[PDB]
Structure 1
Amino acid sequence: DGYFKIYSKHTPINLVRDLPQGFSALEPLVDLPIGINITRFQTLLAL
């Protein structure tokens, strides 16, 4: 409806090259009445 929601989880690993076999359930971090349209994302990285 315009309200943008981010849910997320942080967890320890020791894995070389694939996503970990197991289960997780993302907690709601942040929720905002932003009203914008979103149609394309890109990530932001350090150099």
Structure 2
Amino acid sequence: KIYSKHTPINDLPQGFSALEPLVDLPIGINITRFQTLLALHRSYL
């Protein structure tokens, strides 16, 4: 299950912004570890 929210903000901010349900995927696998993917640009120099 992936839940998401985009909040316009001026530490983490105060107040409430509930995350809406985005997708429920019928995967059925074992998940114990995770890692974030970043994008890197080639230099060309």
Same fold (TM over 0.5): yes
Structure 1 length-normalised TM: 0.74
Question: What's the CA shift for 1:45?
Answer: 0.9
Corresponding residue for 2:5?
Answer: 9
Identical-pair percentage: 100
Question: What's the CA shift for 1:28?
Answer: 0.4
Work out the CA distance in 2 between the residues paired with 1:29 and 1:23.
Answer: 18
User: How many residues are matched?
Assistant: 40
Structure 2: runs of 5+ lacking an equivalent:
40-44
Root-mean-square deviation (CA, aligned residues, Å) is 2.5
Structure 1: runs of 5+ lacking an equivalent:
none
Question: What's the CA shift for 1:21?
Answer: 0.9
Work out the CA distance in 1 between the residues paired with 2:17 and 2:8.
Answer: 12
Normalized per residue, which structure has more strand?
A: 1
Q: Which has the higher contact order (CA 8 A, sep 6+)?
A: 1
